[PDB]
């Protein structure tokens, strides 16, 4: 037998006058998968079926299980459990978010921000669409690498201290990188207008290069660098 302890943030909205608290669970690692989601599923299935969390793909491309593990925002299905038994895994919801229940945060604001940057291809003349494939060279396509792979797990934005204090008016890492994703896409014709949508003190300019976003992104992406690249476009674009 090989026991590992898990301290997990718990809050029930249906329980009268219940405040946020931590609960510990004991798990034999000889009977559990290597990843933290496996643990959460195991304690759900065997110990406590009250532990509520989001999950789906189990392979790290849906971004459902995004949560704070040991002080860092990642995906539970990709983070392997620290086989160090003397240490206790601390599991929290995504930082500075309204807790619906247990580890399930309200992401509807996050999604709404994504909606407001219009994350779809826009052409000046759209009467020809659907009958001929648009041409994009191998180099023009490479520009998208590192940007399109985004999962919208929200780890980065939820790690950004600017997004903590100003998440209402500041779009954050994830959404901003996606605005950049459409900016340098060669097929898009709304580069100038997309930039102008960020011409206020909050939308883009609440980034102060803290760089917590890049350091936490479970997919290895670099939103901070893209934000830096947006800022350079804002200062250089004409008309």
């Amino acid at each position: 037998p090989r026991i590992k302890k898990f301290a997990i943030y718990r809050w029930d909205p249906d329980k009268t006058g219940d405040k946020p608290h931590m609960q510990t669970y004991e798990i034999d690692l000889n009977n559990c998968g290597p990843m933290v989601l496996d643990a959460l599923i195991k304690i759900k299935n065997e110990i406590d079926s009250t532990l509520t969390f989001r999950r789906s793909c189990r392979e790290g491309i849906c971004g459902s299980c995004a949560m704070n593990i040991n002080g860092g925002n990642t995906l539970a299905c990709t983070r392997r459990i620290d086989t160090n038994l003397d240490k206790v895994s601390k599991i929290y919801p995504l930082p500075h978010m309204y807790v619906i229940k247990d580890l399930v945060p309200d992401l509807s604001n996050f999604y709404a921000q994504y909606k407001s940057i219009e994350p779809y291809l826009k052409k000046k003349d759209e009467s020809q669409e659907g009958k001929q494939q648009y041409l994009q060279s191998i180099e023009e396509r490479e520009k998208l690498d590192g940007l399109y792979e985004c999962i919208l797990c929200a780890c980065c934005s939820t790690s950004c201290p600017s997004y903590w204090w100003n998440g209402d008016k500041y779009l954050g890492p994830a959404v901003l990188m996606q605005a950049y994703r459409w900016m340098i896409d060669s097929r898009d014709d709304f580069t100038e207008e997309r930039l102008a949508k960020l011409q206020d003190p909050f939308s883009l300019y609440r980034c102060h290069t803290i760089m917590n976003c890049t350091g936490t992104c479970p997919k290895g992406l670099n939103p901070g660098k893209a934000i830096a690249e947006i800022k350079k476009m804002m200062a250089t674009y004409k008309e």
Partner: protein, 613 residues
């Protein structure tokens, strides 16, 4: 009932599902001017199609000169002549227009020297109607094409005023006198119940891969729409046809794309010999998915396993150039390293045939209309549609071709929207549902919320998953299947004994997973019972006691002077399954496959022949 709030909504159309099919249909309806609702238990991006890795097939002819009819032939041949050719005609012809559409939506397809969409070789595809060698028509966004497909479709969806009921669990269909009126659903956020009524309903809930212990499919593939059709007394189709993808990781069961083999990847047994060159001389390890995994399962059985347990096989990739792997397969390179600790450019990946795709589902027109079966004849269910993995237009039949479902999604999602847009107009009378309608679903919900029994949900789920995995795997026989049937039936009797713990209204995952269990069982019963009744080897369904392929004729010899077998004497027919929800007994019937295409002159019918690659 005075302890549950009921909120009634009114729409022109409801789409249940937010995957490829679900989205494409949803905004397709709104584009046509319909006030549409979209009901999904997950955020649209979290949907399984995001996991898709290989590609989407279209005969665009970017690598070599191609014809869509060649794609038609390959699909029907792969379907082992259980595929309905009217629906296959429609899909393959539309394929180029559907993929061009996606690229025009903004999908970031990988590119060529010409700037056109990069296509690649994939299992089961050929040029010149089989004669002209390997085909390259698998359009892809590197290794993350399903991810890109879902993200651009969702991206596009925001351009319209569709109402998205995010994280809403559909319980049952609102059904009145055979006609569909919408859906009753649970709002996960606050526990409230929502009757969403419409003139037309589209079911795009995807597959039920979670009936088994080992599957590439997500935790959320629980065949919920399949069970909704079942509880309505309507039939499901070909549910015993479960695709085992050859290349799934030995660990968690994660998928490794067929694109690996399409780019030059090889399968290797314990002795090192390229074993797939023996089973398939012409196509090799790039053969049909029912045949490749059949051989892999066979290799383990004669002691050629590749581990300390001798229970798997290797997928070699290290011979391919490092710069090729990084561009064509960045996705699997990461997941192989994460789940198996494998560097793909040096060491092979441990792979094993695991449950993947469900070609069975809700029987359907080439137009996407759900079919009931009355008096041995087909009949359209008024105001009920289905598309995607959840449906069964049987465009895949007995065995699905790789990279055809992402197409199946985009084509028939669009078709559902078009069939509605052409049969009625937005603002037409939304039919009036009964004041007490959907009462059984709320009562079912309430019974499961306070369920204090003796068998935990997870324990009963595991019992079902392990039972299906050992009784209904790659190879199956009458006796093993029959023991499986009376074991799954006994487990349905255990559904009155289940124990639940969470008694809250907000985000009761304990409850929804128990709802998912009721759904999975209904899918399991119909899969296993239909499987045992079918006494032939066709596609993914292989009977060792019935090795032969049983058609109306013996198609190995000439058709000239032969006596045609009666309908109830052969097996080239669709399985239609029903289950009485109370007792849990399975009664089954059969309907004919459609051989005639939409136009003989433009696309000729392909009669049955010897099936081998």
């Amino acid at each position: 009932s005075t302890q549950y709030p009921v909120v009634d909504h009114e729409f022109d159309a409801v789409v249940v599902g937010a995957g490829g099919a679900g989205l494409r249909a949803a905004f397709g309806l709104s584009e046509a001017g319909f006030n549409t609702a979209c009901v999904t238990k997950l955020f649209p991006t979290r949907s399984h199609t995001v996991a898709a890795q290989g590609g989407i097939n279209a005969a665009l002819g970017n690598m070599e000169e191609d014809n869509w009819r060649w794609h038609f032939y390959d699909t029907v041949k792969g379907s082992d002549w259980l595929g309905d050719q009217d629906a296959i005609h429609y899909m393959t012809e539309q394929a180029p227009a559907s993929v061009v559409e996606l690229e025009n939506y903004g999908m970031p397809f990988s590119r060529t020297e010409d700037g056109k969409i990069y296509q690649r070789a994939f299992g089961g595809q050929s040029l010149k109607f089989g004669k002209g060698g390997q085909a390259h028509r698998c359009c892809c966004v590197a290794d993350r094409t399903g991810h890109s497909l879902l993200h651009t479709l969702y991206g596009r969806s925001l351009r319209y005023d569709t109402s998205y009921f995010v994280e809403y669990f559909a319980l049952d269909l609102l059904m009145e006198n055979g006609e569909c009126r919408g859906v009753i659903a649970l709002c996960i956020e606050d526990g409230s119940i929502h009757r969403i009524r419409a003139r037309n309903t589209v079911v795009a809930t995807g597959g039920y891969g979670r009936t088994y212990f080992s599957c590439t499919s997500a935790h959320t593939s629980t065949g919920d729409g399949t069970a909704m059709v079942t509880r309505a007394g309507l039939p499901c189709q070909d549910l015993e046809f479960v695709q085992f993808h050859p290349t799934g990781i030995y660990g968690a069961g994660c998928l490794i794309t067929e694109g690996c083999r399409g780019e030059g990847g090889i399968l290797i047994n314990s002795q090192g010999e390229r074993f797939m060159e023996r089973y398939a001389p012409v196509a090799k390890d790039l053969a049909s998915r029912d045949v490749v995994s059949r051989s892999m399962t066979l290799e383990i059985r004669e002691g050629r396993g590749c581990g300390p347990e001798k229970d798997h096989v290797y997928l070699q990739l290290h011979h391919l150039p490092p710069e090729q792997l990084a561009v064509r397969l960045p996705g699997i390179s990461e997941t192989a390293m994460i789940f198996a600790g494998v560097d793909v450019t040096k060491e092979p990946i441990p792979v094993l045939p695991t449950v993947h795709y469900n070609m069975g589902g809700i029987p359907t027109n080439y137009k996407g209309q759900v079919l009931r079966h009355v008096n041995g004849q087909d009949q359209v269910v008024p105001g009920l549609y289905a598309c995607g993995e959840a449906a069964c237009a049987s465009v895949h039949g007995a065995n699905r071709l790789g990279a055809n479902s992402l197409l199946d999604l985009v084509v028939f999602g669009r078709a559902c929207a078009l069939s509605i847009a052409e049969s009625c107009r937005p603002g037409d009378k939304v039919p009036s549902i009964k004041p007490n309608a959907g009462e059984e679903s709320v009562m079912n919900l309430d019974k499961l919320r306070f369920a204090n029994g003796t068998i935990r949900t997870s324990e009963l789920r595991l019992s079902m998953q392990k039972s299906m995995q050992s009784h209904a795997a790659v190879f199956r026989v009458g006796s093993v299947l029959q023991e499986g049937c009376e074991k799954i039936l006994r487990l349905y009797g255990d559904l009155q004994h289940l124990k639940t713990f969470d008694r809250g209204m907000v985000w009761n995952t304990d409850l929804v997973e128990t709802l998912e269990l009721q759904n999975l069982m209904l899918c399991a019963l119909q899969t296993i019972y239909g499987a045992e009744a079918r006494k032939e080897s066709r596609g993914a369904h292989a009977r060792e006691d019935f090795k032969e392929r049983v058609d109306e004729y013996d198609y190995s010899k000439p058709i000239q002077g032969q006596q045609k077998k009666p309908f109830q004497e052969h097996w080239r027919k669709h399985t239609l399954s029903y289950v009485d929800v109370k007792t849990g007994k399975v009664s089954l019937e059969y309907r004919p496959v459609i051989d005639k295409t939409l136009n003989e002159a433009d696309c000729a019918t392909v009669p049955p022949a010897i099936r081998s690659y």
